[model samples]
Target: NSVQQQLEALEKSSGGRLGVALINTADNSQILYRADERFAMCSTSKVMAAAAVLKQSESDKHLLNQRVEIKKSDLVNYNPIAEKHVNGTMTLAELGAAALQYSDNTAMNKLIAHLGGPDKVTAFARSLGDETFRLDRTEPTLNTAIPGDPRDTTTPLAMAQTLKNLTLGKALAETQRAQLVTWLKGNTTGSASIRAGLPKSWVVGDKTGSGDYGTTNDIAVIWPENHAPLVLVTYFTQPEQKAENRNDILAAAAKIVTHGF
Candidate 1:
């Protein structure tokens, strides 16, 4: 079976709750499987926040070096790195890395504050011509009810296009793009999703997002050996779904898309 066929079968397995966007940069071909469905952005919004921080730094040259103390008050239940650094000070770059790599809720909140809140982040996305991505709230909101706020939602297609923009140097300056991609490559939060599907020789820079209401997603820039890099974004939302199951679906999708690339 082809990649789409396998993905369709996987969607059936999920009771039709999967959304995916896979693109081949070489020819600009793509696959959008339920790609228009919006789901809670979860921690994935950190990518936009990170980009916003870099955009802010472009004007305020010192923004990247600016230091902030990570207070115990900021540390929340899901933030592993920030919890360790309670009362410790770190540069904005370090905090952004924590948010991107570890998906630290506390670190991300600090970033939101630094970027002048979620509105600025959403503005940055808009600058990139993204209409489906929004970030009106912070990460802590995920601790309780999802709020069903349209402000914290994104389509799988939006995420993939964002990665495509980043790869094309539209989202950030070259140096900033390199720095952002480095942090994404160092992502420590998602090991069983997109990265799990790649051959040992291929490289992938990605971010993962999950919510209490069964939203799981991964967006990535994949570098295949001897081929142009590609973007793969997979999202799943259901009433009560297992995280591992979502990861498996993404892994399967990656494997299928890259089979002949």
Candidate 2:
């Protein structure tokens, strides 16, 4: 059966819209469904935050190693890592890991604050050649995925391409690229999404995001048998439901993407 048939079936199970985009870096091949459509970004924006720091560090080498102190007011609801570091100091790299690894809200907020605000992340995306990808709010508020709302949104196509450049593109210095991908590979929160569907032997590093309205997403860079990488982005939204139940749709979507390539 075609990938289209598989994705149509997955959407039937999703009870809402499902968006997918997969790109083969080897030959520029792509398979898309609702790839241009927008979805709530949620914690997925943290990856962009990480990229922004890496990008900024290229000119100011001290950005990553610069010491930053955590404050009590920086802690938020989902910030276990940041809570531990409260009233203590950490490098931007440490906070970045906290945000990407565990989806720490306070970690992201601190990163956003240091970068000056949410718009800077969007500006960083602009530097990556993605025109429509945007991050309009910080955590918590950004997780509000209202139907038809456009804030804190991005298309699967835009995100997939942007991620491709960030992880595998030439814009970053070799050291910076390795640093960003290292954090992505260490992420502990992506297990239920794309990683769940990929072959065990394939090397994969990814970021996952969830929000209201059953929105769950995973964007990944995958390599099988040590060949070139394939970039995949899957965003699934359903009527409100438990967060744990959402990843099954994303896993299935990821499975379909792998098979299609």
Candidate 3:
């Protein structure tokens, strides 16, 4: 079977909710499977927050280098840096790096605050020609009780296109883009999802999102040795599904999407 057929089979067989968008960055060719369905983006929203901060830096110039302190009391869920009980100051760039590299809620919340609010991040994504990506809340405030709520929601296509825009230089300046790319390349999460399916020689820059109600997602830019890079996004959901199952589907999807590239 072709990649599309394989993906369809997997989606149907899993008997769970899934969405995906794969695009060839070279010519904008896309393969979308349930890409229009909205899902909770979880930490993937940080990518937009990161972009907004960089876009804001166009005028501030020194914005990215400005230092801000993260109070211990301000720390919310899953902050490795805060878990150490060290509270001091870190530059905007460092915060962004931590957000993307480790999906740290503390780092991302700080960035969202510095950007003025979560709405600013959503507005920035809109300016990039994305309509299905919404940032209605920051970390610890995300309302996960409602499945696929408007708060921090995104479609697979929107996620893929956002990455495409970043790759095409439509989102951030050269320096800012470089910094974001470096952080993505250094990402330590999503190892069992998109990263698991990739060839050892292929380098992937990506962000992973996970939330309650079994939401698992990964959006990425992949560099193949002899082909132009590709953008891939996958979101999978199942009621009370385990992490391994969620990651297995995404990894399989990645392998199928890159089979020809």
For residues 67-109, write the lDDT of model 2, one tens digit per residue: 8888887777798788887788888988889898899998898
lDDT of each: 0.81, 0.86, 0.82
TM-scores, one per candidate: 0.93, 0.96, 0.93
Per-residue lDDT tens digits for candidate 1, residues 81-121, read 88777777888998899999989888889998887888888
Q: Lowest-lDDT window of 10 residues in candidate 1?
A: 142-151
Residue pairs whose backbone atoms clash in candidate 2: none
lDDT ranking, best first: 2, 3, 1
Among these predictions, the greatest lDDT belongs to 2
Which of 1 and 2 is ahead in TM-score?
2
Residue 5, model 2: Cα distance from true site in angstroms: 1.2
**Candidate 3: segments with Cα more than 4 A from true spot:** 143-145, 240-245
Count: clashes, candidate 1: 0
Ranking by TM-score: 2, 3, 1
* Regions more than 4 Å wrong, model 2: 241-245
